[PDB]
Structures are given as structure tokens and as C-alpha cells.
UniProtKB/Swiss-Prot annotation, chains A, B:
ANK repeats lie at residues 16-46, 50-79, 88-117, 134-163, 167-197, 207-236. Its main location: membrane. Changing D510K: Abolishes channel activity. The chain crosses the membrane at residues 296-316, 354-376, 388-410, 417-437, 461-481, 525-545. Residues 1-295, 377-387, 438-460 are cytoplasmic. This is Transient receptor potential cation channel subfamily V member 5. Ca(2+) binds at D510. Changing D510A: Abolishes Ca(2+) permeation and Ca(2+)-dependent current decay; no effect on monovalent cations permeation. GO terms for molecular function: calcium channel activity; calmodulin binding; identical protein binding; metal ion binding. The lineage of its organism: Eukaryota, Metazoa, Chordata, Craniata, Vertebrata. It is a multi-pass membrane protein. Homotetramer. Probably forms heterotetramers with TRPV6. Interacts with TRPV6. Interacts with S100A10 and probably with the ANAX2-S100A10 heterotetramer. The interaction with S100A10 is required for the trafficking to the plasma membrane. Interacts with calmodulin. Interacts with BSPRY, which results in its inactivation. The chain holds residues 29 to 639 of 730 of the full protein. Glycosylated. Activated by WNK3.
């Protein structure tokens, strides 16, 4: 593990401490080095425990004048890579570029080291184990550290820009993925020009992303705003206001299945959620929502509630029969039972609701056969991804469909006790209509706030409430097991005591007492202790937690509405048929331009 | 007292005002001084009411040229200390160093005053009565005031650095204990070098602390960060990231019983709680918690709850017998009684739970015989110290053990009324499991918040609630003592009225009324006054207090979690056996180094 890295590092340092010749590199004493160079017995192939050469340590501890004599020992020394596990092999260039000393790199290129050699060690690949990521070429190091006078010097001696890597990242993806973008942006601009003398941009990696889409998904707005300016074309400017027109061949991504908007909304990182507030995408999504999305969404919502009221009104009329035998005991109340199937349908009044039952079962099967082919396309863990996409409103629909499908099978075989699935479906169907609050201006924050409140806060709190009610439940049960149950009906057996003390915890039911009899002695002090340890403070603390959760979400509603807006738009455009949705933008073919799509916008900004 | 200091100060000033010769010192007139020096009758041994000499007052009121003539009166004058109670004795150096005039100190050292003399007065020892603390040597004054040109001048004439004191503090402890650390740090660095030409650091005081441990416990982070840099050793630095390795012979304190972490967490001062966020200790405690503590803690918690459910399920089945005699009156409800011991165990169903009873009593005695030898080691007041250590979770465990131990003695002697200790144990055992919320990320703040809320806030508020319920209790009792108790059962006798009005204060029970009869006249207006003076405002004020207590703790949870983490770690490492816990760090013996332990860490910080 990391303890293995510990061990190999200290082993490397003690093996450096061992041998005197390679010690004289880091010691940097010229006289001992000249004496050792005088001897024949002093080899030139001494090697550390990790794969090493004398040139490596001399370049590592920043001694150029101590290395220029070892240049004249043998020119072989610049060509042997390491041979070990953690560092699979690195030449002297990989160490020498990162220290930026120009003279040592000039000496190594004068001797004739390999201009390009790939190095794939355990400490080089991208992972959260390491601290840096740079790629596997000397040009990648020279670019990303930010020394242009070694970039041009190394591009002069070869090292083509179009060169792939493990995981298939070119130099441009490396430059996009880094921090400190204000210094790397102009260097990106400088680096692109040398190859122009498919272009460099259009080649993807193994995952399937162009660098433009990568800069979209990784969440950096600075160089995105920079990179948009190449596609810009200026129109006339008269007085204060100006007019521009943007190219739209790669933002919309028409012919491709994997679009850009769906890719940028469904991202793990937070900062990508910001980049929808830039202009040439915000104007697009606002136009597409204002012109097409809202009527289709409102029609769909109206149809859904008109389905659900028909389900309720065909549910409430169900056939019943007078009970066979009389109650042979007290402690029971039941006077009707379930009717049998053969005598069920006799009349016209019975005949009407059969149409409603067929409508409900047809709606159930058609809503079942729509979400199940969705999850095979992307993956089960991704479809239940996070709250902006709408997972917890998508699980309840298929659960409702499964229960209302099971109800028919339970009805046909004449089974008693069909009240349970019908009751679960009747509560879930009305609680599931809350998903249609996306499409308004002032309800989306409320539904996302109650979702975050029920899944984030109560589940990490319920344990303390559970143990503090269970203790007093057992106490109140054992104090009342020697009295008449006719006089005080609560705390009779064990589960009724548990349910009653849970109800008494939430101040709903009132405290039981009687004045025609006498109660025992422990009950008063235990009830007073329960009243001042569970009712007063343990509930107000949770209410204060609830208010503090509300305050954090209530600041950024104007930013949080638009993300679920565009997610609803892209999903509804994907599932609906093709003929209803036309294209977007302007067709540039008739106006003299060739086979592209454009958008335009004007601005009052100058003075 | 301090009035005695008042009296001795004004008495000293009026005795200075009395005699003319010593008055001419503070007056600083040369002609009268020369006239008095001309006489033989003018003594040189005039003395104040407090022990004094003419040289003392002349040095105190900053007159050097008025003192250089009295130098030639007699060279004896620089050698007599005071002889009194508040200032037990001070030479002229003790006053002269604090005023920083170089020439007077040069004259006194030219005459040959004592270079080192110890002064232990009532106004010199460390106490919250005084305002300053400096030690008992002229070198201590010269160091702590911050004049290096008198430090080197006085170290040139002797005054060894290795010199103890009352309470056994060297010069280094004096320099650590002071404020204004930015000026004293470089002087500490300067002062350490002169003795190097056991070292000075390793000698402790009478309480048993080295200066490193003292700087730990007193809570100053600046010079701790300074003093750590001596032990640092640098490894290779390549590119942006660097690597270092820290020495660990004195932080961990392996062989000693009194460790450093236990000493620094159990401190009265607040600021020490900060110093766990420095790097070479935070990395250590995070590694030790992530690798070893959590599995042992989770196993222990699982075993404890599996014990407690067995206790509850062997508690709920207890033997009972039908009552002997019928109820000869109303106002009573009881139909079962306690079974006698001789007829208790007849059957296999009775035979099963005896194993559970033996398991509970064995667990009780083994949990009793573990916390009692702890309190003899450190002291009773210290084991119940404060909330981070866990006092109020340690008192309830031994109280539970005592009650469940008493239950057996009450059962064997056939005593009636064994419901009371069993009920107290059954509520305390389940409320005591809340201690195991230390080991999670998001429950520690909640348990510390409810602890602070119940011990800090309610106890200082309950008095007002008590008197305002007692008044209305007595009023409602005296208004209803002339009516039939069959019609309105509350307020019958005095304690039922008190309990019922306490229940009505907290809005739990509903307000009693009847409509088949007529009530008296005072009841309506007294009930309305009670409803708008006790229910509405007096409760919402306490709820607002509760919210304001929550807000203060909810800011610093990320700092407050780690202290109880490391306290749990050090306690669990102390009590568990030796074989399960290995050492920490790296053994430096095989790598060429000699018999020390090291840790390493790397950093991406430079650019
Ligand atoms: C059948 C398959 C079932 C799939 C179920 C699908 C489960 C599912 O999709 O929702 C999971 C839930 C959703 O939240 P989400 O995926 O968006 O991810 C973040 C997570 O909720 C963090 O708790 C929040 O951190 P914080 O507020 O900043 O502090 C963060 O808010 P913010 O960063 O935007 O501000 C959230 O965005 O994430 C959890 O909380 C897991 C911890 C649960 C804790 C449970 C403790 C017991
Ligand atoms: C059998 C022996 C029994 C041993 C019992 C053992 C008793 C026991 O161990 O807890 C005592 C309790 C614990 O608090 P603790 O010891 O940590 O000390 C501080 C004390 O609580 C202050 O009230 C707080 O000041 P403030 O919040 O800043 O304003 C401070 O908070 P903060 O500084 O961290 O912010 C606390 O840290 O201290 C009291 O309140 C005593 C006053 C009681 C008042 C009672 C009034 C009637």
C-alpha cells in the first residue's frame, strides 16, 4: 500500500547513502569526484536498489557542473531508463524538465537523448492516490509546468504534437484538466499555432470525449469563455448597442446520440452546474423552454390527474356482502365481508365501472412498459443518480405500477385480504403527482427542499429518538402489568405500549389519567421525567435543525431552478416523437453560407 | 489582604516623605545633596519602614547622576538586600534591570554587586493576586524584559544558565509562559546557543514537565511551530512537491506512563484545544484512528447492545401470582402479587431464563470491577472533569451497576416492592447506550449539544418556572375545596393539584371543564390569567434560549469532533491489552539510523 511506498523510498535513500561514487553527486565535491574518475576500478554502471544511474541523482539534486564531467565519462548514460515497479522507467529528461534548469537540458539534447519516450509508472497514472497528473511525455511536462523556452526548444527537435497516451489523452486534455488556468490559457493559444502549419481538436479519447466536451463536463468556466471566442463572428456595431451571431455546430450536437446538454447536467462535480449561466447556452435553453416545453408539459400533467381521479372513483365502489356468522365473542367488530366473484356482476350499476377497471389496468401496463427499457440503456446506478435528475420520483411510479398490476392477480383467484395492495397504491398514486411541480416558477425549490429534508436529515437522527422511546416504553409496560385492563386501557400488552408511547412522544394524543380510581406510585415521577426529557427539548432541537436546513437552500433558488428545467427539457425532447419537435437555430444555406446553423443575439453593454 | 498591601505602600511613601536625605534622591537637587554629604552627622544607614537603602530609591526614581555621588559614599550600599515581609529582599539590580538604563547597571557591576541572588517575596511568586511573573534571578529579568545588550553583559560576569528556582522553573519555562511571543522567540534562539559551548532542555520542574510538554499544555502554537523545526529533516525536493520526515522520540512518549496526548487533551485552558490542528500530530492521530480504533470500537458497541437486549428480555418475564384477598373497598385496583421464592422454579419454561439472569449478574459485576480502580489512579475530581473526557456517561454506568447488583439482594430475602430498582435500571441502561455515538462523523455534535443544553441551561432557568407554577397551584387548590369530588376530579387534595398544574403548564393535558353543572366564579379569570402568563410567553422564551444555545455550538463541529476522537483513542489504547496494539511509525534501525522512530509526509505547497 502506501506503506510500501514508504519502504521503497527509505530503501532508495539508504542505498544512495551507501555507495561513495553516487554519493559524491549529491555531496558536490569536485576533488573526490576527480580522484574517482582517475581510477579504472570505479565503474560507470553502479545502480541503486530502485532502477537508477549516476546521472539521475546528479540531475535530481540540481548539480549541473557535477554532471558535466560525468557527461564525458560515457554518452551512454543519457539513454538507460529505470527498470522497477513504482517508476517503470524514466530518463534524465523527465527529472530535468521539472527543475527548469536550461543548461542541463541543453547538454542532454546535445548528447542525443530520446526526444519522446513513454513512462507509465504506478506514480504516474491518474488516481486519488497521487497528488499531480501530467501525462507521459517530455513535451507534456514542458507544457504543463509552463516554460515556453523549453517548449519551443523541444518542439524544434521533433516530438510531434499528435501523440496519444495510456487512456488516450492528448496534450490539450492535459492542459484543460489542470488548475491555474490564467497562466495556461495563453500557452494553449501559443501551442495550437505550431500544428496548423482532421485538425488536432477533433480526435477523442477512449471514453469518447472531445476536449470541448471535456472542458464542459469538468467544470471550468474561464477557458470555456476563452474558447467560445474563436467561433464568434461580429455583425455591425452602431452607437452603444452591438450585434453578434454564434456558430452552433458543436454545442447542440444534433446527429450524435450523446448530446452536450445531457452530458453537462449529469455530472458528479458541482462546478459544472455553474457553467449554464454563460450567454450562448442560456439564451438557447430559455428560448427552447419558452416556445415548446411548457404546453406539452401542461397537457401531460392535466391528462395524468384526470387519469388518477378516475382510478380513485373506480376504487371507492367495491362490492361487499353481509357477514355469514355472528360474532361469538366480544373484542371484535366486523359486519361485512368480501363478495365472491360469481355473484359480482348482475346489474347495469355494476356494469358501468368495468370500463374504469379496464382503463386503469391499461394505463398501468402502458406506464410499466416505458421506464423499464430506459434503465438498460445507461445503467441501474446511473438512472437513480441524484436529485436533479429525478430518481425518487422514478422509483415510486414503477412500484405503484407493480402493486396495481398485482391487485388483478389477487382478485381473480378469490383471495381474501385485498385491502393491503389497494391501500398502498392509493396512497402512492396521489403522493406521486408532486413530480409535476418542476414546470413552475415557485414550487421547484419547495419540492427539492422537502426531498433533501426527508432523505438527508431525519435518517441520521431517528436512532436517538428510537432508543429514548424504547426505554420508557419498557418501563411503562412493566409498571402496569398487575392491574385491571378495564380501568386503564393503554399499556395492556407490549406492542400497544410501544405504539402509544410513540404517539405520546409527538404530542398528538393526550396524557392518560383517571380520577375515579387510584394509580400506583412510580408512574408520576417517570411520567414527569419523560415529559421534561422527551417532549420539550428533543423535539425543538429537531425543529431548529429543520430551519437551519431550510435557510441554506433558500439562498440559491434562482440558480437551482434552471438545472432541473433543462433536465426536464432534454428528457422530454428525447422521449417524444420526432415530428412534433423541429430543429433549432437558423438554416444558413439559403443566405449564402454553407450547411451550418447559427444563433444571434444583441447587447447593450459598451456605455 | 490587599488592604494590607495598600497600607504598606502608603506607609512606605510617607516614610520616604519624612526623612530629608533620602528625599533628596527623588527631589534630584545637587546642592542640598552636597551639603548633606559635607556633614559627618548625616548617616549612610538610614532606612525606610519597609527594608530600604538610599540606593534603592535613587535607582527607583531614575536618577543616575544623583546616584553616582552616593556610589562614592560607600561601596557597601550595593550589597544589602531588604529585610521585610512583602519584599523579602531585593538588591539594586532587581530594580535597575527593569528600567533598562545601561549606565547604572554598568556602575553597579563595576562596584561588584552579587551577580546572582534569589528573591522570594509575596509579590514575586506566581498567583492570580499579582499581575506579572518573571522568576527570581537578574538573568531572568534581563531575558524576559527583552534587552539583549544587558543579557550578554550579565552572562559575561557569571550567572550560570543551569540554575533552578522555587517551583523549579529554569529560564526556558519562564520564556515559554509569557505573552508577546514574536519578540521572545528569537531571543530564545539566541539564549540557547551560549550553553552549548544532559543538555538544558531535558531537566524538568517539580510538577514533572519538560519545557516541550509545558509549551504543549499551556497552549501557545507560535513557538511550538518554531520549536518543531529543529527536529525536521528534509528529503529530496523535485518540482512543486516536497517530502519531509519528522522525528518522533518525544511526541509519542512511549516508555513513559504520562504521555503527551493525554496531557494535552485534559487541560483547563481553551487554547490548547487548538494545537491539535498542526500537521505532525494531526497526521499521527488520523492514521491511528483510521487503521485500528474503529473496528475495535464497533465490535465493543455491538457486544454491548446484544447484552442489553438480553437483559430486557429476561426482565420482562417475571413470576406473578393471583391475589389472596378481595378488594374490600373502592378506590383500589390490584389483582396480582409477587410470587414467593419456594414455588418460583418448577418448569422448563422457568428453567430457561435462569441462564439469562446469571449472564446479567456476571456482566454487572465485571462492569463494576473496571471503573473503580480507575479513580484511585488520578483522583475523584479529575475523573469527572469535563464533557470532552466523558464524565456524565461514566457516572451512569456505575449507578446502573449498583442498582442491578442491589436487585439480587432484594430478591433473595423475599422483600415486596422490587419494581423500583428494576425500573430505574431499565431506564438508565437504555439511556446509557448514547455514549457510543463518539465514533461516527455526524452524531458527536448532537450528543455534546444535548449534554450542554441539559446541564447548562435548564438548571439556571427552572427556579422561575417553579415559583410561577406553585402560586397558581395553591390558588386553584383553595378555590375548589367546597365542592363534590365526583364532578371534577382534579384539584382534590394538594399534591394532585400540584402535579396537574405542572402537566397543564406544558400543554400536554387539556383544560378541565364540565357542562352538565355550574362552576364557581373566580376560576374563569384565574384560568385566563394563567393561560396568558404561563402557557404563551414563558415557554416560547425558553425555546428561543434553546435555539440560541444550538447556534453557538453548530459553528465549530469540525474542530470539536477531533478532540473527543483522540480522547477515545488514548483511553482505548491504555485499557486494552498489549498484544493487539503494535507500535507506530517506522523503525529506523535496519535502514542505518540508530534506535529512533520516524514518520514521513509529503506536501504540494510551493507553487
Ligand atoms: C435501488 C437503488 C437505490 C438508489 C438510491 C439513490 C440515492 C440518491 O440518489 O440520493 C442520495 C443522496 C442524494 O444527494 P446527492 O446525490 O445529490 O449528493 C450529495 C449528498 O446528498 C450530500 O449529502 C450533500 O452534501 P452537503 O449538503 O454539501 O453537505 C450534497 O449536497 P450539495 O453538495 O449539493 O450541497 C448532495 O448533493 O446522497 C446522499 O446523501 C447519500 C448519503 C446518505 C446518508 C445516509 C446516512 C445513513
Ligand atoms: C459527584 C461529583 C459531580 C461532578 C460533576 C461534574 C460537573 C461537570 O463536569 O460539568 C460541569 C460543567 C461542564 O462544563 P465545562 O467543565 O466543560 O466548563 C465550562 C462551563 O460549562 C461553562 O459554563 C462554559 O462557559 P461558556 O459556554 O463559554 O459561557 C464552557 O463552555 P465553553 O467555554 O467551551 O464555550 C464550559 O466548557 O461546567 C459548568 O457549567 C459548571 C457550572 C454549573 C452551573 C450550575 C448553576 C446552578
Amino acid at each position: 500500500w502506501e506503506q510500501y511506498r514508504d519502504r521503497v523510498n527509505m530503501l532508495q535513500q539508504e542505498r544512495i547513502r551507501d555507495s561513495p561514487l553516487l554519493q559524491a553527486a549529491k555531496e558536490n565535491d569536485l576533488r573526490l569526484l576527480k580522484i574517482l574518475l582517475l581510477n579504472q576500478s570505479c565503474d560507470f554502471q553502479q545502480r541503486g536498489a530502485v532502477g537508477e544511474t549516476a546521472l539521475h541523482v546528479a540531475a535530481l539534486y540540481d548539480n549541473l557542473e557535477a554532471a558535466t564531467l560525468l557527461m564525458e565519462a560515457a554518452p551512454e548514460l543519457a539513454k538507460e531508463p529505470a527498470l522497477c515497479e513504482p517508476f517503470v522507467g524514466q530518463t534524465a529528461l523527465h527529472i530535468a524538465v521539472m527543475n527548469q534548469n536550461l543548461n542541463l537540458v541543453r547538454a542532454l539534447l546535445a548528447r542525443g537523448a530520446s526526444v519522446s519516450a513513454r513512462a507509465t509508472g504506478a506514480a504516474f497514472r491518474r488516481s486519488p492516490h497521487n497528488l499531480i497528473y501530467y501525462g507521459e511525455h517530455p513535451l507534456s511536462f514542458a507544457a504543463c509546468v509552463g516554460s515556453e523556452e523549453i517548449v519551443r526548444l523541444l518542439i524544434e527537435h521533433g516530438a510531434d504534437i499528435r501523440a496519444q497516451d495510456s487512456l488516450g489523452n492528448t496534450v490539450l486534455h492535459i492542459l484543460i484538466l489542470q488548475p491555474n488556468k490564467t497562466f495556461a490559457c495563453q500557452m494553449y493559444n501559443l501551442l495550437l499555432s505550431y500544428d496548423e502549419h482532421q485538425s488536432l481538436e477533433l480526435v477523442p479519447n477512449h471514453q469518447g470525449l472531445t476536449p470541448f466536451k471535456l472542458a464542459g463536463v469538468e467544470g471550468n468556466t474561464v477557458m470555456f469563455q476563452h474558447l467560445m471566442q474563436k467561433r464568434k463572428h461580429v455583425q455591425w456595431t452602431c452607437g452603444p448597442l452591438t450585434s453578434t451571431l454564434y456558430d452552433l455546430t458543436e454545442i447542440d450536437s444534433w446527429g450524435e446520440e450523446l448530446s452536450f446538454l445531457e452530458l453537462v447536467v449529469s455530472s458528479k462535480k458541482r462546478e459544472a452546474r455553474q457553467i449554464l449561466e454563460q450567454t450562448p447556452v442560456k439564451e438557447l435553453v430559455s428560448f427552447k423552454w419558452k416556445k415548446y416545453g411548457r404546453p406539452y408539459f401542461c397537457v401531460l400533467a392535466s391528462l395524468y390527474i384526470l387519469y388518477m381521479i378516475c382510478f380513485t372513483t373506480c376504487c371507492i365502489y367495491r362490492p361487499l356482502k353481509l357477514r355469514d356468522d355472528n360474532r361469538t365473542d366480544p373484542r371484535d367488530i366486523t359486519i361485512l365481508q368480501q363478495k365472491l366473484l360469481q355473484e359480482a356482476y348482475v346489474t347495469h350499476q355494476d356494469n358501468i365501472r368495468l370500463v374504469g377497471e379496464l382503463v386503469t389496468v391499461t394505463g398501468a401496463v402502458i406506464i410499466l412498459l416505458l421506464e423499464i427499457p430506459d434503465i438498460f440503456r445507461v445503467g441501474a446506478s446511473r438512472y437513480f443518480g441524484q436529485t436533479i435528475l429525478g430518481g425518487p420520483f422514478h422509483v415510486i411510479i414503477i412500484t405503484y405500477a407493480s402493486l396495481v398490476l398485482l391487485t388483478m392477480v389477487m382478485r381473480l383467484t378469490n383471495m381474501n385480504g385485498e385491502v393491503v395492495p389497494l391501500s398502498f397504491a392509493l396512497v402512492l398514486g396521489w403522493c406521486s403527482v408532486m413530480y409535476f411541480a418542476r414546470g413552475f416558477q415557485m414550487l421547484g425549490p419547495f419540492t427539492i427542499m422537502i426531498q433533501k429534508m426527508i432523505f438527508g436529515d431525519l435518517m441520521r437522527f431517528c436512532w436517538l429518538m428510537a432508543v429514548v422511546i424504547l426505554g420508557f416504553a419498557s418501563a411503562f409496560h412493566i409498571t402496569f402489568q398487575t392491574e385491571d385492563p378495564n380501568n386503564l386501557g393503554e399499556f395492556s400488552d407490549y406492542p400497544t405500549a410501544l405504539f402509544s408511547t410513540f404517539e405520546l412522544f409527538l404530542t398528538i394524543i393526550d396524557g392518560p389519567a383517571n380520577y375515579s380510581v387510584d394509580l400506583p406510585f412510580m408512574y408520576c415521577i417517570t411520567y414527569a421525567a419523560f415529559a421534561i426529557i422527551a417532549t420539550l427539548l428533543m423535539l425543538n432541537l429537531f425543529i431548529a435543525m429543520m430551519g437551519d436546513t431550510h435557510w441554506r437552500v433558500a439562498q440559491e433558488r434562482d440558480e437551482l431552478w434552471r438545472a432541473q428545467v433543462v433536465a426536464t427539457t432534454v428528457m422530454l425532447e428525447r422521449k417524444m416523437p420526432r415530428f412534433l419537435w423541429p430543429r433549432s437555430g437558423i438554416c444558413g444555406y439559403e443566405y449564402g453560407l454553407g450547411d451550418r446553423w447559427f444563433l444571434r443575439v444583441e447587447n447593450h453593454h459598451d456605455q
